[PDB]
Design a protein around this ligand. Sequence first.
Ligand SMILES: CC(=O)N[C@@H]1[C@@H](O)[C@H](O[C@@H]2O[C@H](CO[C@H]3O[C@H](CO[C@H]4O[C@H](CO)[C@@H](O)[C@H](O)[C@@H]4O[C@H]4O[C@H](CO)[C@@H](O)[C@H](O)[C@@H]4O)[C@@H](O)[C@H](O[C@H]4O[C@H](CO)[C@@H](O)[C@H](O)[C@@H]4O[C@H]4O[C@H](CO)[C@@H](O)[C@H](O)[C@@H]4O)[C@@H]3O)[C@@H](O)[C@H](O[C@H]3O[C@H](CO)[C@@H](O)[C@H](O)[C@@H]3O[C@H]3O[C@H](CO)[C@@H](O)[C@H](O)[C@@H]3O[C@H]3O[C@H](CO)[C@@H](O)[C@H](O)[C@@H]3O)[C@@H]2O)[C@@H](CO)O[C@H]1O
Ligand SMILES: [Ca+2]
Length: 431
Amino acid sequence: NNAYLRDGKSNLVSKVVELHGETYATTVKMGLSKTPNTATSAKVKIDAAYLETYNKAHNTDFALYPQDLVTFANEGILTVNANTKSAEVEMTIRAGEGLQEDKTYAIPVAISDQSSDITIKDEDAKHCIYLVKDMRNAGDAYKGEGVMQGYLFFEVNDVNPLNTLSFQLENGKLLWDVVVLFAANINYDAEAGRPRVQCNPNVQYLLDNNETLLQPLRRRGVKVLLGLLGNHDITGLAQLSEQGAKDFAREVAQYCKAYNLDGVNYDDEYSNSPDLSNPSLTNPSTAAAARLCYETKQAMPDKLVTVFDWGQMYGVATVDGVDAKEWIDIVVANYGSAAYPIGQMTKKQCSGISMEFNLGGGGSLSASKAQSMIDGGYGWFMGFAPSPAKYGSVFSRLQGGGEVLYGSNVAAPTIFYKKNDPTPYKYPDDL
Ligand SMILES: CC(=O)N[C@@H]1[C@@H](O)[C@H](O[C@@H]2O[C@H](CO[C@H]3O[C@H](CO[C@H]4O[C@H](CO)[C@@H](O)[C@H](O)[C@@H]4O[C@H]4O[C@H](CO)[C@@H](O)[C@H](O)[C@@H]4O)[C@@H](O)[C@H](O[C@H]4O[C@H](CO)[C@@H](O)[C@H](O)[C@@H]4O[C@H]4O[C@H](CO)[C@@H](O)[C@H](O)[C@@H]4O)[C@@H]3O)[C@@H](O)[C@H](O[C@H]3O[C@H](CO)[C@@H](O)[C@H](O)[C@@H]3O[C@H]3O[C@H](CO)[C@@H](O)[C@H](O)[C@@H]3O[C@H]3O[C@H](CO)[C@@H](O)[C@H](O)[C@@H]3O)[C@@H]2O)[C@@H](CO)O[C@H]1O
Ligand SMILES: [Ca+2]
């Protein structure tokens, strides 16, 4: 009887927990491959030694969440359920006064004292892990448990991402949970014969000026992602070999670490055919795209790995035996479509609408559409390329939906930002 451990609320082996209050309650669930017998038993425990193994495997440095803040019900004993081939125990995570903001802590949980009828294949199957972030002060985008969330791309060539702050509900909450700096590029470094991250001068300016133009968003609870995009040479996000994907994933994670960002969006577009003789490249395919997503999540497991569903970026649901739910946090679709889940993903990881704010296509976040997306179980609505000059049209496309999603409509904007300028100007007076 093979067993493994995962978070019961999410069914994820590796679960990022954002604390918005003093406690967070879930279950830890042991899955069994066969119906258990009357004597089958197991417990769970915090396994601090496994954190060293985990940090080494991922080249990360997460600190151990204070154990005194984590409590299991029932002495950590798993209640075995023969009918669902599983066993669970309640786990509570308390927010602590010794915690540092903008730091990820780890709770490695292990199966322990299991009965002799249970087989645990490896140390990965023995453990699940919670990656805990205290977000109590980064609350301004948090609109509630289980609500739909916003995902917004800025064309940073033209528009300052501080304009995220122009979008609030009437109750003062910020609309857009996640924003993308669209976009850094993948390009060939001919002199080195390898792919590299290549940043245009507009992208580079934001990174250089991260403290004033990007970190104020993160202070308010907005996740800031680096967009990655193909860029008219032999390299592309769906045509890296296994080694090329490992190398590029390491570079992307270094950008997110160096600049204190929250993850990436991958958009497989505008690349040319690869040079198949280059050991960093391979045939363009969803298998290569999935490999890159998987390797990027392994290099930054606490951060978001997200894809635009375009080109060959999305569709393979397993890499090295690991399901896509573990390494695709959000998938957003092309304007006019809804994203769909693969593997054990649900529609909570999918956009139900994508709105092209610059060209007009893709529909509106109306009361009717909001209700439709909730009824369908979608987790996200996506928008692309808003600009202060078009706020009239943009905000007309956000009426009614906020009342359905949050009990509070989107408010008319009163602030906007000019490119590369940190000053919140008055909208529309300063236009
Ligand atoms: C998610 C998601 O939505 N994903 C995608 C998303 O990508 C789409 O977004 C649009 O993408 C298209 C395509 O972008 C890519 O290609 C362009 C063009 O690349 C080619 O030309 C370059 C030379 O000019 C070459 O360097 C390059 O190799 C390509 O060459 C081929 O083709 C040319 C001929 O065109 C041949 O000569 C070549 O030989 C070869 O065949 C490219 O510019 C883009 O890359 C830039 O932007 C991305 C981010 O978007 C960055 O990551 C890149 O680093 C890069 O930026 C840097 O370089 C550029 C120069 O290329 C610098 O200007 C910049 O400062 C950086 O340094 C992509 O690779 C785009 O065309 C769309 O752009 C328009 O909209 C955006 C806003 O959304 C504007 O910011 C932008 O200015 C464009 O706006 C014009 O068009 C709009 C209508 O489409 C209109 O609303 C605007 O008002 C404006 O229109 C006015 O000007 C027009 C002339 O430009 C004029 O014709 C018109 O009448 C108006 O007067 C947009 O980004 C979206 C779309 O919904 O969906 C998905 O597909
Ligand atoms: Ca705060």
